[PDB]
Amino acid sequence: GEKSRMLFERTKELFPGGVNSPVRAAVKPYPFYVKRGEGAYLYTVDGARIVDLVLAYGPLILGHKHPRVLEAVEEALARGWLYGAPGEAEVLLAEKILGYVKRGGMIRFVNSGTEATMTAIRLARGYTGRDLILKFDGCYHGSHDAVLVAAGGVPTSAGVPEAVARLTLVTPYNDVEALERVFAEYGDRIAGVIVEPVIANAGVIPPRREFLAALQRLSRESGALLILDEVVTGFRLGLEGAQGYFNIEGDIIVLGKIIGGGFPVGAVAGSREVMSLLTPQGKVFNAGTFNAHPITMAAGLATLKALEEEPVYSVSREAAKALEEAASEVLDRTGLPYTINRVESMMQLFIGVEEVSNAAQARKADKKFYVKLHEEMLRRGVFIAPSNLEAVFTGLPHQGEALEIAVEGLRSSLKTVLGS
Amino acid sequence: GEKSRMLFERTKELFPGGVNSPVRAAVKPYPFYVKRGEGAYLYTVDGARIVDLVLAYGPLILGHKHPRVLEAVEEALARGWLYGAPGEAEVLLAEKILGYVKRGGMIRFVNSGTEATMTAIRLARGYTGRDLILKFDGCYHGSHDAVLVAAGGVPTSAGVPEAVARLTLVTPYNDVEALERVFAEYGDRIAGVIVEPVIANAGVIPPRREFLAALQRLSRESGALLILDEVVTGFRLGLEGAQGYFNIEGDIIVLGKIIGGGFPVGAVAGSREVMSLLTPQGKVFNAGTFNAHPITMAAGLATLKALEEEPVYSVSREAAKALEEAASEVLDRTGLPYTINRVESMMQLFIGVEEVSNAAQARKADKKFYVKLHEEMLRRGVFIAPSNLEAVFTGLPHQGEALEIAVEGLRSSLKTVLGS
Ligand SMILES: Cc1ncc(COP(=O)(O)O)c(CN)c1O
Ligand SMILES: Cc1ncc(COP(=O)(O)O)c(CN)c1O
């Protein structure tokens, strides 16, 4: 790992914490640098092939450099990559996305999930004329002030004015009693309730039907808009995302990751009535030099076509199931308390706890055990998130030999850590 | 324009205002759709070649599909386009950028100018422990709450809480007296003063030396960080940007557009002391799935190399000068009040006013005349921003025949509008 070591030294003084995104710094023993990626694999700068169970944290459900997407991007590149004026790809991608998540509605393309949720929140506030936003402990919506808050709302980040943080309410995920209580107290001032249909940033945590039911009922009865943050679930839990998977409906649907095919993206979709408030039609401001970036649009379009024509969902589901069954077989024999949460192709293991239905329980999981597992798996050529609070993602290339390596790696790594 | 007309009809119900960014909707008679771009030209979906004096509003100083950048991106695409782990290109681009704008400092790559200024503001607040941010009337820093404010600070966008807007102070650009007064009253609570060294979103407005002097003095004496928003000026006003061009120094330098070579990008650069507050090193949060996107990094790196090895600055400067001289020759003969502001390769014409040193004066310019000019120029195959408040940008391909067409087009269009 000499080459990665050298790069590690160079970035120490170039980037805060040596990385451009926090999670990247936690890789053990130290972050490896990537030369390239193809299919189910990442290849380090030193030349090592690694099975990728991170998939850039969600966007790469088709694996690395998917042939169909590569070809579409090559064609798009030949046409120039930025215009500052409308292109064709954005129209086709919008029509395809809306047909699955909000028929007859509108969409606005942005450049990150952070920009997307931020825009959704401004839209909900503009539509209702209210200021408060309700989020849940453990849910992650990006790097912007309004969502960098925790229940005393107080800042979880330095540099966030307390005056801003106090406009965001926070209650526990899957806690119906707490949800009812917050609406009883502040309901008429809540502009929107934002939530991940399946938590992906506090490990993976599935929603309780009762929580989903309350979210829809309380939002509708209070006048608050239900903002489903589907940046991760969108197009991962089937073509119709969380709405179709759980049979729920959101007022505003925030999308990202997968819809950009691996390129910078974010999007806000909703009814014509709500979406029409966005500039230049309405007074809720949103603009972006890179909005509807030609390459992002071409990549996302090709990606969704693959999701419609290739067995991505079945393959990804089976891959996650195989990993879950393998880990469960080993862990069940130990008699140690543990739980694995899986929803289709997103999952995570929690050692030390028998149930994880909220962030508080996820935080009680054995972090040391997880870190050791991450390191041992990497030593065996399999890459899983370095943080127990991140998720494990599967995709199209996780089949055949690649899957065999991942499963065998997981089995052996668990045994090694359990034997230490 | 049948094909653009058809697309126009399709997007009416897909996007708010029919576009993904406000300015795009103002093109006359209606927005044309782009098939591709190459060199100094955009090509409509109907097949018409148009000289581009918009350059995607700043990023394309090298023109469309620059050969060197295209090759670098092709090589990068073959390596996969998203890893979720550190790559080599981000290291090289960071080293090159910092060598020109903040030697010995640090940088953090994000996905838009909006994310960049938003991150800079959070950093300034975190570093100083203060809440107030001072901006100037007419300056544009992106699509986020803290900068969508105007002096009563009150919201300029619906959906922005008044509690948030009041944390942002606003005074006129180039107004030293007003600047001194605001610091005398609120100085000890100002975390940072953000400003465009050259305004590019209220037409083009150059800074007064006295204003630049006051900005540096007052920030230093008050403890507020001077945030130079160089999203547009960075790498356009020479390799050293505004700091080198005007011989000024900022505490935090916000970069974007050009540094991404045409791909989604944004960046915050500053001293190690300030930048070290960013996660995972410090407590000022910033994370991004697409931060340091492999393709953006490769494109930006190749772009900066071109700026160092090709006569981009001289060619672009001469192009803008030729346009300015041509327009001035025609307008001087009319005796009508007007002014053209130009700083290297960024400029704008203001009809009806003899001086434009601030946003208030820019707003007094004859908008109807400008719109007619935009439409007439487009009819003659030359594309300038549809809004008088946007800027005209020149670049490397604006030479030879392309420049002749632009200049002749400007001359003829002015005469036609002046004769109507
Ligand atoms: C649900 C959710 N929302 C928002 C984001 C942030 O997306 P981005 O990093 O592109 O700003 C993420 C990524 N962790 C996410 O998982
Ligand atoms: C000075 C400045 N700052 C910020 C921005 C916004 O950049 P972006 O559109 O990528 O969010 C712009 C683009 N108009 C700008 O000119």
With a CB cutoff of 8 Å and minimum separation 6, the contacts of B127 are A159, B191, B225, B274, B277, B284
Do residues A59 and A262 make contact, with C-beta atoms less than 8 angstroms apart?
Answer: yes
Do residues A62 and A345 make contact, with C-beta atoms less than 8 angstroms apart?
Answer: no
- Contact at CB, A289 and B23, closer than 8 angstroms: no
Give B115 Cα–ligand 2 centroid separation in angstroms: 9
Catalytic residue among B41, B140, B173, B370: B140
List the single residue in B with minimal CA-CA distance to A281: B17
- Contact at CB, A283 and B144, closer than 8 angstroms: no
Q: Quick one: tokens of A400?
A: 């055949």
- Contact at CB, A280 and B16, closer than 8 angstroms: yes
**Catalytic site includes residue B257:** yes
Reply yes or no: is the peptide bond before residue A31 cis, omega within 30 of 0: no
Separation CA B76–CA A37 (nearest Å): 11
Do residues A292 and B21 make contact, with C-beta atoms less than 8 angstroms apart?
Answer: yes
Give B346 Cα–ligand 1 centroid separation in angstroms: 35
Per-residue HEC secondary structure of B202-269 comes to CCCECCCHHHHHHHHHHHHHHCCEEEEECCCCCCCCCCCHHHHHHCCCCCEEEEEHHHHCCCCCEEEE
Beta-carbon pairs below 8 A across chains A and B: 376
B1-66+311-420 and B67-310 share one CATH topology?
no
**Side-chain-side CA neighbours of residue A312 (13 Å):** 23
Residues paired with residue A255 on neighbouring β-strands, in sequence order: A267
Separation CA B38–CA B75 (nearest Å): 19
Domain A1-66+311-420: assigned CATH number? 3.90.1150.10
Residues paired with residue A267 on neighbouring β-strands, in sequence order: A109, A255
- Contact at CB, B119 and A56, closer than 8 angstroms: no
Q: Which of A65, A143, A160 to mutate to test the interface with B (most CBs of B within 10 A)?
A: A143
Ramachandran category for residue A137: left, alpha or beta (phi over 0 → left; psi -120 to 50 → alpha): beta
- Nearest neighbour of B143 by CB, restricted to A22, A31, A285: A285
> Quick one: which ligand is closest to B256's CA?
2
Do residues A169 and A112 make contact, with C-beta atoms less than 8 angstroms apart?
Answer: no
Q: Per residue in A88-119, is it b (16+ CB within 10 Å) or e — as a string?
A: bbbbbbbebbbebbbeebbbbbbbbbbbbbbb
Q: Quick one: tokens of B198?
A: 């050259």
Do residues A245 and A71 make contact, with C-beta atoms less than 8 angstroms apart?
Answer: no
- What are the residue ranges of helices labelled H in B292-366? 294-309, 312-334, 359-362
Stated in angstroms to one decimal place, the resolution of this structure is 1.7
Bridge pairing between strands A346-351 and A338-343: antiparallel
Smallest Cα–Cα separation from B53: which of B382, B381, B375, B369? Answer: B382
Domain B67-310 classification at class level: alpha beta
Coil vs helix vs strand at B26: helix
Domain locations along chain B: 1-66+311-420, 67-310
**Residues of chain A neighbouring B277 (CB-CB closer than 8 A):** 16, 158-159
Q: Quick one: tokens of A184?
A: 């009883």
With a CB cutoff of 8 Å and minimum separation 6, the contacts of B99 are none
With a CB cutoff of 8 Å and minimum separation 6, the contacts of B186 are B132, B134, B169
**Catalytic site includes residue B283:** no
Q: Structure solved using which method?
A: X-ray
**Residues of chain A neighbouring B31 (CB-CB closer than 8 A):** 85-86
